[PDB]
Amino acid sequence: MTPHINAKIGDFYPQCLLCGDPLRVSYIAKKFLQDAKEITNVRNMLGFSGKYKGRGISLMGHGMGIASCTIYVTELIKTYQVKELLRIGTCGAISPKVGLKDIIMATGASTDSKTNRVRFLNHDLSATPDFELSLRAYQTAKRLGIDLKVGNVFSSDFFYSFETHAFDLMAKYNHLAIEMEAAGLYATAMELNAKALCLCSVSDHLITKEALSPKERVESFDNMIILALEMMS
Amino acid sequence: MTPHINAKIGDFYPQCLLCGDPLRVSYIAKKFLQDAKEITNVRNMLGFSGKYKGRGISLMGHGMGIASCTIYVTELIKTYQVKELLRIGTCGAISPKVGLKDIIMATGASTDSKTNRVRFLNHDLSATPDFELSLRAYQTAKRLGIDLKVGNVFSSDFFYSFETHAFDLMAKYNHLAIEMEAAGLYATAMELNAKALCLCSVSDHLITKEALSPKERVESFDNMIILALEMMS
Amino acid sequence: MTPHINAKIGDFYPQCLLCGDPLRVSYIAKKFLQDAKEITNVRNMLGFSGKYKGRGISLMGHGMGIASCTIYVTELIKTYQVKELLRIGTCGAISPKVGLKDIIMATGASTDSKTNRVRFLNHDLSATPDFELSLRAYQTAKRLGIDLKVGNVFSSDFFYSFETHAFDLMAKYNHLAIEMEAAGLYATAMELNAKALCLCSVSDHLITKEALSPKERVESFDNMIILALEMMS
Amino acid sequence: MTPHINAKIGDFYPQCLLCGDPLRVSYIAKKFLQDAKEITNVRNMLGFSGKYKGRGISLMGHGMGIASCTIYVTELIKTYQVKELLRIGTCGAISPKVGLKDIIMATGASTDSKTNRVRFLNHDLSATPDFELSLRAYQTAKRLGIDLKVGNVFSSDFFYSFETHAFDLMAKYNHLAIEMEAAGLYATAMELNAKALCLCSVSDHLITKEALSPKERVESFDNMIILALEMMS
Amino acid sequence: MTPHINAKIGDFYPQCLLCGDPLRVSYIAKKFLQDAKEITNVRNMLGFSGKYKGRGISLMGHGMGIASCTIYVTELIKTYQVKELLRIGTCGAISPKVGLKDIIMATGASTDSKTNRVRFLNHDLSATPDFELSLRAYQTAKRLGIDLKVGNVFSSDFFYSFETHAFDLMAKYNHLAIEMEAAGLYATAMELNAKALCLCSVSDHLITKEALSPKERVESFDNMIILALEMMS
Amino acid sequence: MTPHINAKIGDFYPQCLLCGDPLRVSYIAKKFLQDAKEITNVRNMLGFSGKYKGRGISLMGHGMGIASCTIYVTELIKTYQVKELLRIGTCGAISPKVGLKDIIMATGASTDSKTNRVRFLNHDLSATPDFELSLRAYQTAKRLGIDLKVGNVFSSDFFYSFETHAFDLMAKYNHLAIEMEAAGLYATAMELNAKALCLCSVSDHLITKEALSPKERVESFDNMIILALEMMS
């Protein structure tokens, strides 16, 4: 149907959760959704549709990096009529204002990619989420007893960075964590007039070098899953 | 005291309203503040402190352009201990999603300036406001019956643009209006761990050419002044 | 051992074939090698070890885009001691010098990514494969009766391009096709002193709009696989 | 008449002296001009028209930073028919070739702004003054016995620099001092076929941290005012 | 004694004429110098010392392109203690303010080269000549009755331009003609604290499409050779 | 018939050898080619035609620097129908992988020039040689018992480098040596669909600080000239 998704037209609900890892998406469908159905599996990049509290939710994996994420987000919006995209995932914290198990809401995504300069006149595109989704995240968190840590993330083309000396400057300008897709998810949604947000769970702190156990990673991520599913229903 | 502000240390309250035009600042102090006093007038750039709803509120003009804005808010934060900065002004609309008399909340500020590349490793800094201020703005607007328009603005180094052909692309990427300081205000407050937000009043639509009358301009700006003073009080 | 590969130490042979699509990796293992074993499956990105003419060879998926490829190639080399990396995939031809079913050998990978500027002093890194590997591909292609097309590819961060007007200029400068990882593969191998080559199968011509049928794509990819395994044996 | 200038057509003489501070423009009017008349006061940015030794001369403030300066100069040239723009002011000296009380003629204005790459094809524009104006300055400086230092100046977007370590390299390349607008003045006059020149007075040496006193500062600026008024009458 | 000049210490005079064409240099030696001797010839690039009307004067070729001109200029200043360098040659006119047999004095050289950004913090270096030289060239051409045209040139890395569409814009910004070295000549003299200037003869006009006859060519040139030699004595 | 080459059409053979130093192409003409003949001498840039083991061969000098090399390669290809261009010269070694007297085949040419960004959409053009020339060079050298060292060179605009600290990073990314032309040759030949290759001999070593004596020069260069003539014959 598209080069990277083999779902039937109409297989996706208009609200879609996203993770880089398709096995995480599979985890969510199996453990949290009723009547979950795998609807796409091209390149092993799984997607699902199902129900949370009687409301249709879709789930899609998008792979690693801005360019992979942009492909899947573009197709979801343009072909499968997805309207709200909520990306959840882990991110490595870089600021003293956050600690392990915090959930970060990215109200901006800085980047070392050239993609937004290519998209946007070789100027500075401030890649931002949709405000209404941000507000709904904030209200849902408060009602679930989650204190969201709110600021920028830095979306890098590099997992193994050549600029680790720059993390302090990043944190100084209110970047709470690093990840690798948010700047692309946001720019793509701005391009295509869709609503997007990125929420990140802090499982590793890149400055203090603290890190969650395997058991603390699943329970931490489960709390962010419930935040996400509750703000979509 | 500073080369551009001759206020005594402690003359500014920790919350400050900003406008580019110091005569607008003077107008606010006279008409809307209780017991206002002029606290600075270097280079004719006026600033005031007064009371609103029994509460201390400061006003400061910052001139035109990112470079001028950056001078004044660096000094307010680092010398005068200002903690919260709310910028209000007019902005030229470029998007069909906004019309005359709308108030825009800028949740991102793109730019053609080099200043953030200089600040931020030659990468893309997503210049964003403080989320708690933006939440306060949204809730106050709602109480006042204001239908707040929320999106990016584009902060240009050019009043007379050489890139008019690009306003449609800017609008496509959710830039609601163009102005000349938000990116610098946001970057500087990010740099200095302060809270900032820009609100923009639509007095002219740059695409469809419609314009407010002189009386409608006064009313429109007054509506924004009330919003601003109510969210800080 | 790494965040993205769960193979045991020594699971990888020092020669490794790469594809973006892990399911093609899996196909090669099941159809073309003997005693094939799945050695890694983090994020559904499958990797294999097996034998071709009794010589050990490994296979690994690397996902889409320079950022994803760079992660997997960095890890293969630094942790798993892989020394020779040969990437085969499909590409979108932009030059009249090539047509459907052609196999392109990328002696250079131009890019619109910023990653090599970040890696290399903000100058122009000419990302290139290992000559001996490319010499070896040429000799194997001749002794196989394959008419190897030879030239540059363009690695883009965009599957859905914003610069399709530029494909003719690219073709002028001897870019035969467009893909999305070569420049990252080549730069990573240059950084880490390993040997890499990208081979490119034309299944769609982006100018003439010709395309292969599903049956023909199977046949065309199978020949490229043979060239790859032969030059590794 | 223009959004930023209050004057009626013909209020401005074709020659105009400029400073960032409107209160210096006001000081020049009162102390040095006969029949002086305030002709514009938008945003408290003052301008005047008067006579010096029977010659009609205009004065205009332009605020701080390239963007603010560019607004005012554009409107002076394109609406008020100003042909010759002479900017005087202070500047922080960075060169061992100059010292307190020296007056510098800016034969080039380097910048960290992006505005000239926006104007000029993303190449390097050498912003320069009009030669005939620079000759009149040299000739008038000699007639008055002023030892005119001649060289480049660096126009920064930052009053509070993030690259103070770079001042030595600037001086090495014959930048005598730092200010914040000459590069935009020069580029605006080049765009609009007008004659512009910048002179600036050293009352503070940024490297040796020598400063003038609140007494020699007044007389230094007077010396420069007289030089400017002379070379225009 | 340098890798590119095989002259002896002291064999250069502190005033030197340069051209890209060494064969044009000999023409100046034979037809204008008394006691003329060839002093260097590596890579067939010729230089001369002789006397003009009783004042000693050197001549040197510098090849084509900024990088070539930078090599020779650097060695002339650093090793042979040249202090004044005057560059003459022809240049394609692009402005309607100049016609054939006009001599252009370049008060600024803009460029599409990256060399000055590498020299100068990736900012905009305004590459300018030494003022007192330019003042000399002005006085000399006047009592010699030459109507010297003064403005900018654009130094390109490209003789065969890929941006011919842009000459009009260059002309708008007071670029009278295009050549290929002035930006590197001026920047190198700034870096090493020497005094340089560049003069330019219009023999071809790139907009209008005239060309001088071969008769008028080394006729217009000699009028500028004379101008040059006159302003060194 | 071009502004920089004197020869008549028909004087150049299709295969052409290139050097920067025109005295060096003269050396080659007198020692190695029978029926040698000088065919151009504009700007003292000499070219020659003769025979080697029967087949006709041309020689041409091109000066120093990408801009200079580009003028000549362009005129050669476009006016004089040259179709193979083989560049030989000396290069400063920067890698431990090569020692003096080694012969380097440049399979890619990185650069600090802006010229390829100007040519190629401000992206990263990977400048590479024609693959068949490089295959000829390798088969020949193997027959002549020469151990060919293959990798990138770095083409710089700077002979006297401002980034000497970066040579280690260049060599880490498989840059064996530095020169000033290869990226311009490779990109001009890509632009104009001609076959080009660069070879250079290591007479000095920039990191270890060796050299060859005046006569070790001449002999190592001869081993390269014989490689070149053999592969064109």
Curated annotation (Swiss-Prot), chains A, B, C, D, E, F:
It holds the Pfam family PNP_UDP_1. It catalyses: a purine D-ribonucleoside + phosphate = a purine nucleobase + alpha-D-ribose 1-phosphate; a purine 2'-deoxy-D-ribonucleoside + phosphate = a purine nucleobase + 2-deoxy-alpha-D-ribose 1-phosphate. GO terms for cellular component: cytosol. It comes from the Bacteria. The record marks 217 as: Important for catalytic activity. PROSITE patterns: PNP_UDP_1. Phosphate binds at residues 20, 24, 43, 87-90. The active site is at residue 204. Disulfide bonds: none annotated. One of its GO terms (molecular function) is purine-nucleoside phosphorylase activity. Its EC number is 2.4.2.1. Keywords: Glycosyltransferase, Transferase. InterPro entries: DeoD-type (IPR004402), Nucleoside_phosphorylase_CS (IPR018016), Nucleoside_phosphorylase_d (IPR000845), Nucleoside_phosphorylase_sf (IPR035994). It is an enzyme of class 2 (transferase). A purine D-ribonucleoside binds at residues 4, 179-181, 203-204. GO terms for biological process: purine nucleoside catabolic process. Catalyzes the reversible phosphorolytic breakdown of the N-glycosidic bond in the beta-(deoxy)ribonucleoside molecules, with the formation of the corresponding free purine bases and pentose-1-phosphate. Homohexamer; trimer of homodimers. Belongs to the PNP/UDP phosphorylase family. PANTHER family: FI09636P-RELATED (PTHR43691:SF11), URIDINE PHOSPHORYLASE (PTHR43691). This is Purine nucleoside phosphorylase DeoD-type. The gene is deoD.
